[PDB]
Structure formats: C-alpha cells, structure tokens
Amino acid sequence: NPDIEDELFQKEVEAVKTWWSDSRWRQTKRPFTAEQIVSKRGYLPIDYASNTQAKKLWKILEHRFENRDASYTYGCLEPTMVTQMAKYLDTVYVSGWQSSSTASASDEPGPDLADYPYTTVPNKVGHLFMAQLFHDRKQRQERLSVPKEQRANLLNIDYLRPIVADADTGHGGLTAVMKLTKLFIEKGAAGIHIEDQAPGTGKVLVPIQEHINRLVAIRAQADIMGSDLLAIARTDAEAATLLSTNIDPRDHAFILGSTNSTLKPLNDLMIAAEATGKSGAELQRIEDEWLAKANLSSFDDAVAAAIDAGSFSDKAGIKQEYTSRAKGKSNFEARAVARQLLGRDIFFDWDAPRTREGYFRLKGGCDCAVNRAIAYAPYCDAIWMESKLPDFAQAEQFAQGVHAVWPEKKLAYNLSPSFNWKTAMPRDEQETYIRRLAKLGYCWQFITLAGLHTTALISDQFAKAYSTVGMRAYGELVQEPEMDQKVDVVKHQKWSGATYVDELQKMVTGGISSTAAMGAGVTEDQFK
Amino acid sequence: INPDIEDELFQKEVEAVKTWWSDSRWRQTKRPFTAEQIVSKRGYLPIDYASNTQAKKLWKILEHRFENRDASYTYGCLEPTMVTQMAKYLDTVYVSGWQSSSTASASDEPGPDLADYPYTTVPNKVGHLFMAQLFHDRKQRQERLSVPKEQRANLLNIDYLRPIVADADTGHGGLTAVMKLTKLFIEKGAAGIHIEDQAPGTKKCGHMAGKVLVPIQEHINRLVAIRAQADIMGSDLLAIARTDAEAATLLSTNIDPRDHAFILGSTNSTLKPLNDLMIAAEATGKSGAELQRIEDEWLAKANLSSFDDAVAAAIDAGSFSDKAGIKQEYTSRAKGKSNFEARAVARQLLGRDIFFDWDAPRTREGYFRLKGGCDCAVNRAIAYAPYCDAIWMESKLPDFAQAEQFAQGVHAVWPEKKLAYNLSPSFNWKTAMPRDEQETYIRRLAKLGYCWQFITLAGLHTTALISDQFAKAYSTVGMRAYGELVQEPEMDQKVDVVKHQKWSGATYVDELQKMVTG
Numbered sequence A: 001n002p003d004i005e006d007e008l009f010q011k012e013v014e015a016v017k018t019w020w021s022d023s024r025w026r027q028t029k030r031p032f033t034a035e036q037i038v039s040k041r042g043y044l045p046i047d048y049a050s051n052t053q054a055k056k057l058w059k060i061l062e063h064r065f066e067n068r069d070a071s072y073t074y075g076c077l078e079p080t081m082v083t084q085m086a087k088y089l090d091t092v093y094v095s096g097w098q099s100s101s102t103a104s105a106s107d108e109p110g111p112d113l114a115d116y117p118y119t120t121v122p123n124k125v126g127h128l129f130m131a132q133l134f135h136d137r138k139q140r141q142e143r144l145s146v147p148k149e150q151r152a153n154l155l156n157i158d159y160l161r162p163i164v165a166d167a168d169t170g171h172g173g174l175t176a177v178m179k180l181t182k183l184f185i186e187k188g189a190a191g192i193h194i195e196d197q198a199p200g201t202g203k204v205l206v207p208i209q210e211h212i213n214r215l216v217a218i219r220a221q222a223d224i225m226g227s228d229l230l231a232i233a234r235t236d237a238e239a240a241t242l243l244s245t246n247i248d249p250r251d252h253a254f255i256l257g258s259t260n261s262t263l264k265p266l267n268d269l270m271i272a273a274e275a276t277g278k279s280g281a282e283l284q285r286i287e288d289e290w291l292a293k294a295n296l297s298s299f300d301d302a303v304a305a306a307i308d309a310g311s312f313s314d315k316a317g318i319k320q321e322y323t324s325r326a327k328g329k330s331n332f333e334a335r336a337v338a339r340q341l342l343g344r345d346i347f348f349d350w351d352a353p354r355t356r357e358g359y360f361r362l363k364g365g366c367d368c369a370v371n372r373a374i375a376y377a378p379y380c381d382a383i384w385m386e387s388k389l390p391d392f393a394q395a396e397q398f399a400q401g402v403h404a405v406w407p408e409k410k411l412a413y414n415l416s417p418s419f420n421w422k423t424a425m426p427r428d429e430q431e432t433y434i435r436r437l438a439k440l441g442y443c444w445q446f447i448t449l450a451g452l453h454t455t456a457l458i459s460d461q462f463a464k465a466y467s468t469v470g471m472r473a474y475g476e477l478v479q480e481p482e483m484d485q486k487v488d489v490v491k492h493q494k495w496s497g498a499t500y501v502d503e504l505q506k507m508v509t510g511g512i513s514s515t516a517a518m519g520a521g522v523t524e525d526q527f528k
Numbered sequence B: 001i002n003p004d005i006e007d008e009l010f011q012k013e014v015e016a017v018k019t020w021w022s023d024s025r026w027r028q029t030k031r032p033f034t035a036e037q038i039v040s041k042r043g044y045l046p047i048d049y050a051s052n053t054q055a056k057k058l059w060k061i062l063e064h065r066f067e068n069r070d071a072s073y074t075y076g077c078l079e080p081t082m083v084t085q086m087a088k089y090l091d092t093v094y095v096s097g098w099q100s101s102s103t104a105s106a107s108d109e110p111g112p113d114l115a116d117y118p119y120t121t122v123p124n125k126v127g128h129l130f131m132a133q134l135f136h137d138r139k140q141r142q143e144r145l146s147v148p149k150e151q152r153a154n155l156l157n158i159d160y161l162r163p164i165v166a167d168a169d170t171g172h173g174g175l176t177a178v179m180k181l182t183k184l185f186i187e188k189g190a191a192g193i194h195i196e197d198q199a200p201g202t203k204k205c206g207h208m209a210g211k212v213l214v215p216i217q218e219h220i221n222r223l224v225a226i227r228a229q230a231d232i233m234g235s236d237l238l239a240i241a242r243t244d245a246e247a248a249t250l251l252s253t254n255i256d257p258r259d260h261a262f263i264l265g266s267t268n269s270t271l272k273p274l275n276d277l278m279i280a281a282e283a284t285g286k287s288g289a290e291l292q293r294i295e296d297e298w299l300a301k302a303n304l305s306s307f308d309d310a311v312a313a314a315i316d317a318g319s320f321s322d323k324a325g326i327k328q329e330y331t332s333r334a335k336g337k338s339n340f341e342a343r344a345v346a347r348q349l350l351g352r353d354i355f356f357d358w359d360a361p362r363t364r365e366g367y368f369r370l371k372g373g374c375d376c377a378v379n380r381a382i383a384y385a386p387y388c389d390a391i392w393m394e395s396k397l398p399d400f401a402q403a404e405q406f407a408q409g410v411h412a413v414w415p416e417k418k419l420a421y422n423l424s425p426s427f428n429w430k431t432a433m434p435r436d437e438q439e440t441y442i443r444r445l446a447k448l449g450y451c452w453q454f455i456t457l458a459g460l461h462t463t464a465l466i467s468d469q470f471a472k473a474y475s476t477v478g479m480r481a482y483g484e485l486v487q488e489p490e491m492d493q494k495v496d497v498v499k500h501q502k503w504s505g506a507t508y509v510d511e512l513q514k515m516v517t518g
C-alpha cells in the first residue's frame, strides 16, 4: 500500500518535469525540484480556471515582445467598466492603489499603503473575473440562438481578457506571499506583480535576496497548484532612498555611508535631541543638517576620494586595481582589498546615518534599479521599474541596462496619471509614447488609475449638470450619447443577461414561462 | 441581570419608547404592536446605530421638501469614487438593487434584476459607500482645521454625509427574513429603505414583464416587520413602499378581499381549467411555442373579466326589468366586499348565480390573472400608507398625466403623503419627452408631492459611457486619449480626484502616523 504511494509520487514527479520542460518555462530558473513540489501536494489535483487565463496572457505577451509591440490597459474598478474595456483592450489590470480607496475587503478606505487585509486585491480579481465569465455565457447563448448567417450583426466581444493584479510587496513573510498567491490563483489571476519595498513602510526597499525569495515563493505556490501564472517583478529602486537591511552584498555598491568621522551617530543624536523638547520641523532640520555634513557616499567612491587626497604614488594605478579587485564584491572584502592597497582602513560608517527605524541610506536611481532587475530576471516573466516621470531617455537606459545581460527580458511600464501628460509632453509625442516604448521591449503597459479618474470625471460632470438642468442632463450627457455610440449597456436588461436567464428558466420549465422578464411589455422595446 | 428590579428596567425602557413614539417623526405611523412588546424583544446592550443619525437627517430633508413642494433628487451609486463626487451636488444617495445585481452581488455572481443574489448584497453596498463617506468626512475635518479660520475660505467644504436610501427588493423571503435584512441595513448605514409588493422568487425590475404581486396584507406585514425591527433597534429609519401594480398581470394568491375587484375570472362555462389542459399537453410531449399557444387561445376564449363586470354584463344581457336600478344597487352593496359576499349579493339581486371562475385561468404556478393599472396601484398605495413614510408607483413611461393621476388618487385619502418617483433610464427619454420638458419634469413632479426622485441606473450608464469612450480612444491614440478625454477635463473642471494622493487621504494618514510615532 506504500508501494502505490511511491509509484504515485514518482509518476506525478514525472508529470511535473514534463510540464516544466514546456516552452512556457524556458527563461525560468527554479531553485527547487519537482520532487520537493509534488511532496507538498495532496491527492486532489485542481486545474484552476485562472490557469486558462495565465496561458492566454503568456501567448499574448510572447506575441507582443516578439513583434516589439505592446498590450496596454488600465486599472479596472468594477464589472461595468470591465465589460466595456473588453471591447478594445486585451488585458485587464487590477490596481492596489484603486483597491485601497475603492475596494478594501473591510470597507475601510485610505491612501495607497497596502494596509488593507490581503484578501482585498484577490477579491477584486474574483469580482471582475466572475463577471467576465457571466457575460461570456450570456453572449454564447445569444449568438447560438440564431443560425450562423444571422450572426454578422451580433456582438462578438472577448470578455475573457486575462487579468493582471497588484500583489503589493506580498503582505508579510514568505508564507503570506504563498497564501496570497494561492488566493489570486483561485480567484482568477492570470498574472501578478510584486515589488521590492518593505511592508508597513522616501521609499524603503528590502535586500535583493528577500525579493528574490518572494518571487520563488510565488512560483512555488503556482507549481503546487499546476498553474502557468505569470510573475512580474517591480523595483522601486529608481526613487527609493532607504534600505531595510544591509546583509545582501549585491546591495553594497548602493549603500551610502558617512565619510565624516567627527559626527556622532545620527540615531543617538536624534534620540538625545528629542528629550530636550526640541521637535517637529526642527528635528527634521537637524537630520538634514547632519546628513549634509556627513558627505554620504559608497565605499568605492570613498576609497577613490581617499586615494586622490592621500600620500600615494601612481594614484591612477591604485584606483584601477582597486576597481579590478573590489567592485561588485561584498563590503567586507572591499575593505580587506582597500586595506591592503592603501596600508590603512579609510573611514566609512554606513551604520551612523541610519534612520530612527534602523534603515540604511540607499543610493537609488536607474543604476540601482538595473542592478536589481538583472538579479530578479531569471525568477520573473517581466520586469518593471517604477517611474518618477515619463522620461523616455531613462526608460531606454533601464531597458538597455537589463537587455545587455538578459536580451529577451519582457518589460512592463507604468503610464502613470500622477504624471501631467501636458507639461511632460506635446500631443503627437503622447500619441506615439506607448508604441515607442514598445520598441524597447516594454510589451505590457498600463495606466494604474484611469478607472478612478474616468469615473471621477463623469460623476462630477453628470451630478453637476443633473443638479442644474435636472433630467435634461441625463438625456443629453448620458442616454443619447449611449444610443449614438451604440453602447452595449443602453439596453441594460439585455446587457445584464435578462434574456440569458429567461432562456435558462424556460429550459427547466417545459419551454415556456408565465413570468419571463423579457416577454410582454418590457420597456426595452423603447430602444432600437 | 439581577431580578428584584428587572421589571423596573423593563418599565423605564418601555416609557422611553413611548416617549420616542410620541415624537412628530411618527405622526403618520401606525404601529399594530405595543412598546411593551418591542422592549421585551430587546436585550440589555442597547445600541444607537450610526445609520440613525442619517435617518434623522433624511427625515428632516424630506419633511422640508414636501412642506415646500420641492424635491431632493439623486441617482444610483456604484462605488466610493462616485459617491465623493455626487456629494458636492446631491443631498442624498440611492443604492440600487438592479445595479447591485449586475455589479455587486455578495457572491460575485452577477445577473439580471431578479433579487436572486444573497440578501447581504445591498446592505454590503450600503456599508461600502457609508464607510467611505465617514472616511472622507474625517479627511476633510483634519484638512480644514489644520489651518486657521481666516484662511479656510477656499478649502473644500463638501458634505460627505449624504443620507443613503437602499433597495430591499421584496424583502428576500418571509417576515423573519425581512426583519433580518432590515437589521443588516440599519447596522450597515441605511437612512431609509424601499420594499415592493412583488413575490420573491419571481421578482422583476419594474420595467420588466412577468411581474407577480403578493396580496395587499402580505406587503403590509412586510412594512410592519420593517418598523418593528427599526423599533427594536431604536432607529428612525424611513420605509418606502413601492407598488408594481401599474403593469403587473399576475397575483400570487387571492386571499385578500381588497384585491378581489382586480382579479380576472373566466366567464366561459364551456372551458376546462387551463392548468388541466396544460398538464395533459405537457404529459403527452407538447412544449414550447405549441404549449404557449394552447394557453394563449384558452385565455382568449375565457373572456376574462372582474366579477363586478361579469355581474353588469349579465344584467345588460339577461331578462331583467330596471337594469340601471339593479346595477346601481349591485355596485353599491358589493363594492370592496369579498368575492363570497359579492356573489351572495348578486344571487339575491339576480335570483341566480352567474358563472364566474378565477381558479380556472391560473398559471401552472397557481398565479391569478390580475387587472393591473393605476387604479389597482392607487388601491394598494392607499392601503400601504399608514405603514410607510413615502409611496412609489412604477410606470411604463415618464408620463406626467398618470403621475398626477396617481398623486391625486393617494392624496384624496392621505393628503399629506410623501411620494417618491423613479426617473427611469429604462425609459427612452428622447422619444418619451421633449428636452424643454425634461428640464422641468422634476420640478413639475415635485408640485404633486414627489419629494424624493431618483435615476436608478445613472451610476451604471455614466460609468458605461465614459468607459466605452475612453477605452476605445485609448486603444487607438494611446496616451493622447488620456490627456484629452480624462486628465485635462479633470484639471479644467477642478475635480478633487485629480490630486489623487491628497483626495485619497495621504495627508490625513501621514498626520496620523506623525501623531502616534513622535
């Protein structure tokens, strides 16, 4: 009976290895085995509906990247929006930002801090997805009720547009990341993105290995569930200024230290200064004054500057060898190198400038982001660098930086509304911006908050007009334009599936019903 | 609880309820139960729900509107972004069952307006909007107070606390369900709720066909149960009664004599019962259109009529002397009486029993054929009035004459009755009415006493329109669409939300953090 136990195990391990050899995974590094995955499984395998959508999303993005084109979309609020988006956009984005103000699982709104319960964004995914599935059924019923020659004038909308959803930073430790991933897969996510900030928190990043572990945790949970779920890695290193801890050597090139040995450690100072009553913007001015005085820099620059100013001969020679031996090495090894080339230990204190929470100062910018992107690359299907402004030159630089090492790496891009597409750009450049970016390998792009803003705008316009000219505003600003533009929803009973469900009930009750919603005198006959 | 007193606590709480019920809020309200009965259903942890504050405010608003023959008007709200923009211009909010069905089922399974979502659905939407209203109200107080008085003049001063009126459908089941649903609504934030005289299980949008009503007494019971639960909880919650009688053609049962004048019967004694025909047709394989035609022409042959009309018809056609006289006396003695009693009158006046069978035309579910219309609706509304704070009749068109006819009908009996009106997008407004009348329709209806009016589905359609428009343009000219169609009209009309970090409360929470950290 444990005979079978082992055979069942081996056969399922074999099935997983076969799956893993599929082209979906050719750019994917797994730091675990099929045996380890399968032994985490139970005996009731499930093929999740979302898996179909993950596979669909993969083919789309593969297609786009190969043709150096882009799929682009925006953050969707709710099902009405998603049924209209489905006409023109081939993917759907679910935004953590929009969810915080609009869809917290506990109904408590607030700013974008990822401090809603973590059910929030997965629930919204299920919200939209379940609606997509419904309208898909609705439409198949309507199309199949007439012969194919009479279908040319019927809508043929693809409602099954793959959803990509915000996973924030994973909402806790690695086991939270896996449970969160699990939720997403069962709710309908085709893909999720996870960013290298620290939860509960200038932005604060986590060490490179910690985000890598997050990505591995996502993949592992997907593997356990048999899902082709896409994982998108986002880095906030472009504008980040802080780092939670310093134990990852791949980070050491971007950790800023104090080069001023006169200074008392910042935390000790701020602590003492808070006792003395002193507070508010005066503590903040102390911190700023201290930081300025500290002449922050990387260890490598600190070594080069010390070389430039000290008693040494052949200064260009010492520098080039220090670079040759120390760059991209841990700080502990860079120090040993420097001591042996300089005959002394130069002064460099990266603990002194730490914040009240113990965060290290980070040299953020495009370089930092590229360094992180390259390390994340084999653990994610696409990479995304959060952008301060829509800067094409910077987008080119990040793309080149990543592609110099991973030329096939799919990129994602945030076309953000926090920008001002007016002062940032003239009109014809705006019209081509997505297409130009697509050339660089940005194959999936999105406006995080367009759902928020379109809703805000129409609601303010209509409510205002409504309160001034009454019912006339409805005809003029809503219903007549719906009619002229042949919007779906204007015949709202049909759109909502009234016919679909009448036909359902008639099927169970002998082909007729005394209480058919769309019979007799529905007032939708007032609409052509 | 210690005994010895127990009665004392009971009798002091009873007095408090009696004092409460004497407030002018209740001057038109009939309660068929006592304060003693209500208090003895309570526990020992009384709660004043936040929704009660909103109910009192809504009441104050509607009193003012009706007394001045003006109206508050609003529309169905989808989600919090919408409600923060509505708040600037509209002093109430509507939460729609229709919209909830397509966009907010508690189980995420959408569908047409049949109230077949879990009944948690519309209360959850009420809470969704209300928790957001509360939040933005907090956000704004912090923002305004953070500067001194003399420089708040330009700051936003939006009233986010707009009272919510919510859709209770038919009550989602029996009276114990109605009370549990009412309880939810009250704890979620409702200032008022509406409930209609349809049967659950068959419930339709008012502008769908196939509507089945319940007896007048059953809807009365629903309304009393709502009030009882509000009374148990100490809320001033408004209750709005909706009747679907204007277009309904069916009735769930005929037990209530107040319905009898509107129930259609067969006058053809040659016919077998319709259902028996249907059963035989089905039992031998007939279905679909073939089955429907059997029903259709059976109904034609049956010459459907009310019993009163059948009596008049029989007088007109029979051997009688002084036919105007018997008609006079019949109408008089039979009006508003049960069918049983009206039959007895007709037998006495005519000397024989005329043929009349309203069982015979019943549907396969056992529903009766109803003679719907404005008269049927006025009858129901007049009966509902002592049990609700406003009345609403669904109509097929935005028709001023019928709206007036309904108002006159109700006010003939209850001159001070608040009315509500559905400004329905199920109407094609362009064909139903000229633009110059559209602009005055609300004001004109308010003169009749329509003091609360609402566009049920404007949330749906506004979102649908701007979404189709933007997604289309976006798909063709990319980010240019975003600057043109969204961002710059936003900046131009000074929409709140354009500064999205601030609008969302970033400053509010930042200041919270600073407070609990330093």
Ligand SMILES: [Mn+2]
Pocket: B096, B097, B098, B167, B169, B205
């Ligand atoms: Mn409704």
